[PDB]
Structure formats: C-alpha cells, structure tokens
C-alpha cells in the first residue's frame, strides 16, 4: 500500500495473507468470506509468465494477522488449503480478465475479534455503492513504494496498511491505459492534482477492495486487487476484479455438491 497508514488492530478481520511454505514469504493478499472459504486473485495462484502454478501443498493462509513478519500466536490462525478453484475463463493474456480464485480451507476456523468474514455484494449493493467518486478501502502487506534505492526490504511495512481510494469513471479508466479494460474490471485512485495520493503495490494483489454500506452498516468486497502500471503514478489507476460481476461463478463453486 502506497501512501497508506498502519491499520488499527481488528480493522480488516477478513484480511488473509497467502504464504509460500518453502521459502517462507508473503505471496498475495486474500479475503475471508466464510468460516471455510477464502477469495483471492487467480494470478496469485496461476501465472505462467513467472512459471507459477501452485498446488495446495505449496501454500498456507494466515488470518487475524496485524504484523507482517511476527508469528502472532494468541491471535492469528494458520490454515492449509483443501482445494484451489480458478475461474475457468481466466485469461492471463491481455491482463487478467476474470482475475478471481477461491481457496477452500482444509478446516473451518473459529471467528474472533481478529477473524471475521466480509460480505459479498448483491445487485442492490452494487447499484448503490458503485459510483464514480465513492471511496472504498484497500489493505495489504505490500510495498510502500514502487521502487527503492537499496533493497525491497526498505519499502516493506511492519504492520498491515490501509488506504481509502475513490472509484473512477470507466471512460477515465479506459483513457488512462492502452490495455483493453473489460466489464470484469474497474479502476480506483486519485486524479492528478486531486491533492491526495495512494495505491496498491507489489504484494497487495489478491487483497480486497471493500466499501461500507450506509444502509446496513456492513462491509462488502466490491473488488480484488488485480493489476497496475506502476504504483501511485500520476494519470494511472489501480485495476480491480469486479467481484459482483463474477458472483455467479462464486456461487456455482460454493454451492457445488463436492464442496
């Protein structure tokens, strides 16, 4: 998160860190949507250009984490994965159409002060909340800057970062980049000389873009951090998977008999 702040304890209890077993390292953000199901971006799991194709044996998820590096024993839960589900029409050519994946936890977790699912939007939610200029919120453990002088270590946060960013009009999103933008994406961020800044950056992807409903006081994940050209560059915007538009596939997977 570029230009964000230390999140208060318990700010984002649905926040999940996806973790490689060997070497131990942070891979991506993710979110908790039930006691048993975790949402993330497809590209966190499958990305041929980096020869990346994880199996369940490769990964752990960590939940209720506040620190980036500490092991927080009385507080965080580490879980193995039972199954990976990548959207069947995920097109990692042309920047990541349908950049969505579900991970089923090997075991259902107890909820706590620090662990709690986010709501997924329905039709009304999307209609009410998705308007240019309405602000959502992005959280993650990724880089605090796009580049560094000496080492990546220098831009890494000690604690979960948060930033609030406005939805941007589709035409403005399309005009900001030469990549083809689909209906499965949206962009957010400040325009140059709005006089505020902020963005997701490396290590935040797969993490959630949430909005709070005024109507029911509940948090909803409208987005998954998907892609960007740099972090926090003027005239550029973060792109996010449109969760509501892909909800039918989410429902299909979860309602399936097997899991």
């Amino acid at each position: 998160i570029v230009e964000g702040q230390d999140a208060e304890v318990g700010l984002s209890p649905w926040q999940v860190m996806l973790f490689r077993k060997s070497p131990q390292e942070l891979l991506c953000g993710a979110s908790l949507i039930s006691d048993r199901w975790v949402l993330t971006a497809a590209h966190c799991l499958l990305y041929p250009p980096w020869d990346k194709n994880f199996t369940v044996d490769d990964l752990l998820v960590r939940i209720g984490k506040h620190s980036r590096t500490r092991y927080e024993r009385k507080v965080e839960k580490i879980s193995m994965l039972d199954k990976i589900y990548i959207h069947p029409r995920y097109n990692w050519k042309e920047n990541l159409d349908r950049d969505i994946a579900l991970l089923k936890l090997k075991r259902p977790i107890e909820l706590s002060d620090y662990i709690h699912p986010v709501c997924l939007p329905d039709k009304q939610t999307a209609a009410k909340l998705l308007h240019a200029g309405f602000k959502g919120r992005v959280t993650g453990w990724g880089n605090r800057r796009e580049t560094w002088t000496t080492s990546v270590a220098e831009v890494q946060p000690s604690v979960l970062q948060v930033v609030n960013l406005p939805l941007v009009e589709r035409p403005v999103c399309k005009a900001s980049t030469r990549i083809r933008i689909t209906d499965n994406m949206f962009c957010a961020g400040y325009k140059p000389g709005e006089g505020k800044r902020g963005d997701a950056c490396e290590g935040d992807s797969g993490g959630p873009f949430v909005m709070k409903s005024p109507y029911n006081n509940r948090w909803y994940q409208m987005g998954i951090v998907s892609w960007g050209e740099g972090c926090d560059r003027d005239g550029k915007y973060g792109f996010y998977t449109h969760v509501f538009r892909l909800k039918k596939w989410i429902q299909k997977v979860i309602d399936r008999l097997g899991s």
């Binding site: 250009p49 500490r70 990549i179 490396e202 050209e229």
Partner: protein, 65 residues
C-alpha cells in the same frame, strides 16, 4: 501484478514506453543515454518477479511437514 520498469532489453510484461506495459508478443529495447525505450514486436522474457522477501518469525513445524 504490478508492471514496473523493464530493467534489461528483451524483457516484456514491464513498463517500457513511459507508463505502458510492453505486452506478450513484444519486447523492450532499452534506450541508453538520451534514447527513448521502444516496445517492439518480438519474443520477450517476462521481467522476473521481485521476491516479497522477508524476515518472518518461524511458525510451528507442523505447518510444513
């Protein structure tokens, strides 16, 4: 994924011309001194991912073996 600046010629899936990704069937000719970069048709190598590298405290051994 964040596309960041191409760091050697031949790379793709990185920012080549200004703030624009140089995509798959293309590669990035790096300008040196006073030269612009060019994204050209050709086979490129993806710029390697930066390892999200840390000093993690060790978690129980049970979560590996």
């Amino acid at each position: 994924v964040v596309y960041t600046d191409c760091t050697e010629s031949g790379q793709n899936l990185c920012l080549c011309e200004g703030s624009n990704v140089x995509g798959q069937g293309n590669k990035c000719i790096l300008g040196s001194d006073g030269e612009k970069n060019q994204x050209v048709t050709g086979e490129g190598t993806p710029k390697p991912q930066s390892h999200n590298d840390g000093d993690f405290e060790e978690i129980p051994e049970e979560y590996l073996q």
